[PDB]
Amino acid sequence: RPIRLLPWLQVVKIGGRVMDRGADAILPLVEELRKLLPEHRLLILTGAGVRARHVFSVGLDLGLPVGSLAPLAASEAGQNGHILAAMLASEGVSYVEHPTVADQLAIHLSATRAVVGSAFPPYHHHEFPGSRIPPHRADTGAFLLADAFGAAGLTIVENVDGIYTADPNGPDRGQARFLPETSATDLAKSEGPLPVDRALLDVMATARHIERVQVVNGLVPGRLTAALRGEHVGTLIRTGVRPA
Amino acid sequence: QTLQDRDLTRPVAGKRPIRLLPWLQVVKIGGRVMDRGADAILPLVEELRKLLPEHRLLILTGAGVRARHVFSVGLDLGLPVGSLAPLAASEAGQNGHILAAMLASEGVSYVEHPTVADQLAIHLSATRAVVGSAFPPYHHHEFPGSRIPPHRADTGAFLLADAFGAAGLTIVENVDGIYTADPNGPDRGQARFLPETSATDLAKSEGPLPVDRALLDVMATARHIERVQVVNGLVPGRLTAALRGEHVGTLIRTGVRPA
Amino acid sequence: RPIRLLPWLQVVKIGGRVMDRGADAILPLVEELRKLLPEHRLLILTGAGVRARHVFSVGLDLGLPVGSLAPLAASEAGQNGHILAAMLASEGVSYVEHPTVADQLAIHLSATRAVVGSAFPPYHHHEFPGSRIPPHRADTGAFLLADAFGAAGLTIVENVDGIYTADPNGPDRGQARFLPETSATDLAKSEGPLPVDRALLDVMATARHIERVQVVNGLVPGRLTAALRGEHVGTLIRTGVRPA
Amino acid sequence: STAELEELLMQRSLTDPQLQAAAAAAADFRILPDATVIKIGGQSVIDRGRAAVYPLVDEIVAARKNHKLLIGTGAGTRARHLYSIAAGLGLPAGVLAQLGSSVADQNAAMLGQLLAKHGIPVVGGAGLSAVPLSLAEVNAVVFSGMPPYKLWMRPAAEGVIPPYRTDAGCFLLAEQFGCKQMIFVKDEDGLYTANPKTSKDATFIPRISVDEMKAKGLHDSILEFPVLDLLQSAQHVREVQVVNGLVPGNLTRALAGEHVGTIITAS
Amino acid sequence: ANSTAELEELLMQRSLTDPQLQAAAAAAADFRILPDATVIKIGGQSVIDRGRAAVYPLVDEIVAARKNHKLLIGTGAGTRARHLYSIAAGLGLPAGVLAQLGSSVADQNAAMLGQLLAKHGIPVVGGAGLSAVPLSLAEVNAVVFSGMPPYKLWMRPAAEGVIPPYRTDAGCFLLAEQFGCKQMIFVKDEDGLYTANPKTSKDATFIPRISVDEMKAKGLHDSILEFPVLDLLQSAQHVREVQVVNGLVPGNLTRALAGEHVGTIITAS
Amino acid sequence: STAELEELLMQRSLTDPQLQAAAAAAADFRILPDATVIKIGGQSVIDRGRAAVYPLVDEIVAARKNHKLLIGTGAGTRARHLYSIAAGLGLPAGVLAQLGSSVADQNAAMLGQLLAKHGIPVVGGAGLSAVPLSLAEVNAVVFSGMPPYKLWMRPAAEGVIPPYRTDAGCFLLAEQFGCKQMIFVKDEDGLYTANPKTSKDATFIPRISVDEMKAKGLHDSILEFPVLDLLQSAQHVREVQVVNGLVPGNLTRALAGEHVGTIITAS
Ligand SMILES: Nc1ncnc2c1ncn2[C@@H]1O[C@H](COP(=O)(O)OP(=O)(O)OP(=O)(O)O)[C@@H](O)[C@H]1O
Ligand SMILES: Nc1ncnc2c1ncn2[C@@H]1O[C@H](COP(=O)(O)OP(=O)(O)OP(=O)(O)O)[C@@H](O)[C@H]1O
Ligand SMILES: Nc1ncnc2c1ncn2[C@@H]1O[C@H](COP(=O)(O)OP(=O)(O)OP(=O)(O)O)[C@@H](O)[C@H]1O
Ligand SMILES: Nc1ncnc2c1ncn2[C@@H]1O[C@H](COP(=O)(O)OP(=O)(O)O)[C@@H](O)[C@H]1O
Ligand SMILES: Nc1ncnc2c1ncn2[C@@H]1O[C@H](COP(=O)(O)OP(=O)(O)O)[C@@H](O)[C@H]1O
Ligand SMILES: Nc1ncnc2c1ncn2[C@@H]1O[C@H](COP(=O)(O)OP(=O)(O)O)[C@@H](O)[C@H]1O
Ligand SMILES: [Mg+2]
Ligand SMILES: [Mg+2]
Ligand SMILES: [Mg+2]
Ligand SMILES: [Mg+2]
């Protein structure tokens, strides 16, 4: 299998909806991130959240195709990244654009303990057709990077405890049962909503390095920290990469 | 300590914006200092070299005489103020390229304004100082009114320093500080040195200053920087003394409250 | 003479034809470069190799002028740099584009022990006419940089031991005698092929700092390490710069 | 005297009143005198989707046969959401400026894609290098309305909301290029004595000076209040017109110089 | 088809993975950005690598064609990309690294073709946004672009191996799909699809017309086009068939542009 | 032979004389054979301001009706000042090169803004991607005349002044694109036996070869001296014309091919 480019890297994807909660969620997250900088080398990747839903509403009303909507959503993930990086700037953390993530991450992580980037991939006009909603979103972009780098982990920071058998905030939340552990293939066979992109399950099937991804509640201080040490504090997704 | 301070029912000042780079020292080098060439630049480079292990520095260069020349040509061509602004900013950039090259062996490079706005924290974790242009990138969107671009090197450097919430901004000039008249001008016989002044006092005055008049306007809306010292960079050691807060030139009070 | 910008820098040019040999050559070179990182600060510059020959074949067949062929070849040196940098990414090494090499190398070499760049200069449409083959190639570009920086050295890493009196893989190989040491002025007087650009000798004539450049066989492990310590293990080219 | 101006420029500080007065006598060149700058409201137009944008796209396509248009976009609701997140964190106005810019960029991209098949491009970059050719050839360009101040954004007297937003961004481009007019396209007929959306009986105002607006407390009503000051300092654009883009034909008539909404004058 | 208010409600409340939201978004109006434009791919290995004898006649057809058609002309990469992939694959590098190497080769080919067309006013366009396309198409009726998708390190890998599965076929096809173009033509060096590789099978049967599902049934899924393109074709909203033509035969591109069937037509269904 | 060239390209070093000779027999494509490159002087023209620039803007606007123009700018006195500052500091030619490029950029921006209302753009970037479309549609572009060598600038035999400046940058572009003519627009009628500003004895030279200029000691007189060698190496542009842009009509007549100033020939 491929060599690992950055085997010592930890990748942390921050849900756009966590950022949407504003200071009440961002301030505790920033303090937890601050305390993690001396423990891990971090690539922090932000999702898009509700503003992407708004630009989809306008864009779809205008009839725009999926390759139009994809960079419009990616922009919102970039803005969350600028906000988060600014809160950590005094610690040496800056937001970096996708060409820098792709080609110069090693030198920047030699200079500083963490950088922030967009979790969305730069698919732009070349997003896949089929759905009118861009399929390769923040979870999918974060995982593609983490696996391509051969990183030590990818942790997904959500506004819920993990994956449930139905939307825990949706019309069927009375049936929602928590899944401590699941496989990408089992998830992919189900119908219904998930807190992670369905395309994430597709790129997990072709993954070469990352064996598990944990989805943890960023609204509970300490869970990101525990998850970065491999503690089980959310939903574990087995990717189907097997270990030695 | 005042009776008004004790009044529980009076309006309270809003919190200040979070500081992005609170440990940073910002140093603005005048373009006219650079214009003196090696005689001024070499001692300044040696002084900067010795400051690198003591301070983390954003070194921002002004434009100097070449911007006066491009203003002369551009005004003769009739060009508006939003055309003149990026032409002058270019000269501040060239001074930055020159100064950074003199410090390259110390790990110092010049960075363009997108890097200054967005990636300064990473670069200052890599190295002790970086150089940039002090002019802001107002370009086409410079404010009309004067045919001379108002937001120049002093103004850009202060906007950055105050936005960063930096520890200070020191302006390095080719004179001792601010006088009551141009100390090199036709009335230099009447010029009186001002060790200390407030920006509001300077703003009401008329006549030339060694600093942009827009500097005083952006000081009025400043949130962090309380004072800016203008010191003579042609006198070795004054920049060093100013960065430690010693009073060696003109102190401008911005009007930001301390407590 | 001009000040030295980066007097502590070692510049190492990696031949495109060395990269063309693939893992058999690259993996040992990468291990040697890895062990050199704690000893030296390195600007590693890659040449172009056989793919530039192919794009020359197509471009010349299409009739394109030399300022068209120059950036097409430089692109292949860039791709070799991307490949080499990815192999060293876990050491904090990234490939950087030519604006970064020109303006921000000092910051990046404060962050990390080595960066990779293209050895071709960005002459693009302003390449000199005369030959239909771009004259200012990888050796030349690497020397212009090394000399402009006033670097401590430039070492050229070849797929042969050094310079011979004829092409040691060509039709007169039986008459090829090895040259342990030579001057650029003598080489410039000779007719025939060389393992280095002829333009290299021309920019050596106007050099301000670099007194000697060693060509060593990167297929022999240890020769790059020894050359970086001044050991004579290939061909020394004297530039004609004398002590100040 | 080019020589006295040249002499002052070399020998005085740029703050010297004598130099400033000499520079004010310089000739005044208009770069795009035949072009018109239009702002398409973010909140008032683009955020309303198809029912608002499609009729204005038709007007723009029809109008570019007789007028040269620089079409700037507002930002609107998504920028307001970004400002609320960032202001709630206490981030300074310089950081928020970037956030609003990306939303204006989104809206320029969406508008631009509806116009691409008519040859009309979205232009950007610090220099706006694509404007002269596009304007000569297809008579219109779309640009993002935020000024490029970024971290060098001047803050307001209070709070961290950037005071120079897409009204200012569009107005300053009209002024810099010396355009023949500046038209703000919104979702109301123009200026009223109060917000017509929340006011029972506000009175429509068809013409008003900047000083009259300030005296009536309407400084920050229909346009970003700093735009009134830029307007009074402007060399080339000494008045603006605000029109209701939801009424078909208002933009077209305004482009032809018709008084159809509110005309705001510097003097 | 549902409603604006219900799509809006769903967009604000549900995950984008919610099938109810997905179905409502599927009912949105469909705008074609460049409905009068045609995307053509000029083969890398099949055409541009062949040099003047292949490229110059096709330059002539393009110059003549842009008087009647609006052309987006994408380039393949070809044998230099195959060489980079061999070196990089041998080093254990992943598909995301190889992707950037292939992009540079398609860039080279676009620059070479573009320089042959520059005196006709036809530019090479690039950058994330392809900002120069609308003015160029309106004014000179043609643009040249590099055919690699911009996925770079985010390239999706194939199930086996590190060769990037989305290359210049996919890059060209997706632009035709994104812009809602009226057709997609692949210019290669064979008349079209055969039952086997016509270069290495002397008795291969030519196939003038085939569906994706029939290509897969015959084991031709990765024969004439990159195999993911067939799945992209079945997912496409705007371009539901493509035509592959022999660019070494004079007039084939010209006739295909006019809508004539001169090679193999591959249909989604 | 294509097949032998292919084999030599694969099997020899690019330094091999047999390979170099086979490459020289390749076909020669001219990319923009109907275009003309002109240099507008930095020190000789643009630094003179309105009295020199405005008449030439008028000629450019009228001439682009009949001629396709690539208009490059010199740098001039601000570059001279930067070189003097940087040389006094001991900076090398590769550092000075980037300083001169900024000044040529300034001059292209100023000239471009005078031409913007005629649709004529300023073009830049390593590839000059905007040239083909702009030339087809408005028949002219403005570019910055410095070569992009930056830190890779080849130094002169003596001193640190970049020896390839805006004469060389404009000439090499004319040569690369196979243009039909290269016209240098300066402030004297052409070459003289000595600098006419300092020498009463100076006599005009209408036509001269590179080798004759060198024999007269004129190798570094009206043009940067490396331009004379680049001219003798050129495949496409085998002569250049220098004309006085301070005399109306000289540029216009030179563009139609007329000998109005000095013609300098490779041989
Ligand atoms: N099966 C499920 N388990 C858990 N949450 C679910 C499930 N299905 C839907 N959800 C919803 O998804 C929400 C998380 O939202 P979402 O994943 O869209 O935002 P995000 O990940 O923060 O945004 P982005 O993807 O832009 O980073 C949860 O609050 C929950 O309401
Ligand atoms: N009241 C004043 N006090 C002090 N100096 C003054 C005053 N008025 C005018 N000056 C002049 O201003 C000169 C400095 O000029 P200026 O501020 O333009 O240079 P600079 O700051 O180096 O340039 P830049 O703004 O481009 O960085 C002083 O040498 C002095 O002659
Ligand atoms: N006089 C000579 N001495 C040594 N080698 C020679 C000589 N003449 C020709 N050569 C040939 O040059 C070959 C090296 O080729 P070349 O210099 O083109 O590769 P490179 O330097 O790896 O490529 P690039 O310049 O793209 O980095 C040697 O293997 C040898 O066959
Ligand atoms: N007096 C007025 N006349 C006309 N329009 C107004 C007036 N006051 C406000 N508006 C318009 O109403 C819109 C929104 O008003 P604002 O005060 O920003 O509140 P909100 O944005 O919360 O609705 C703006 O587009 C503004 O121009
Ligand atoms: N059944 C088939 N019919 C036609 N071509 C085939 C078939 N099977 C394999 N091929 C091969 O597919 C390849 C497609 O050509 P290629 O060079 O990949 O095109 P491009 O240069 O446009 O990418 C050719 O090698 C062709 O011979
Ligand atoms: N022998 C000569 N003949 C003509 N001009 C000369 C000669 N020697 C020096 N010059 C000077 O060269 C100047 C043109 O060069 P320059 O001003 O550098 O042009 P540009 O501005 O185009 O770069 C003329 O003004 C002239 O005074
Ligand atoms: Mg989620
Ligand atoms: Mg000053
Ligand atoms: Mg070699
Ligand atoms: Mg000159």
Ligand code: NA
């Ligand atoms: Na072209």
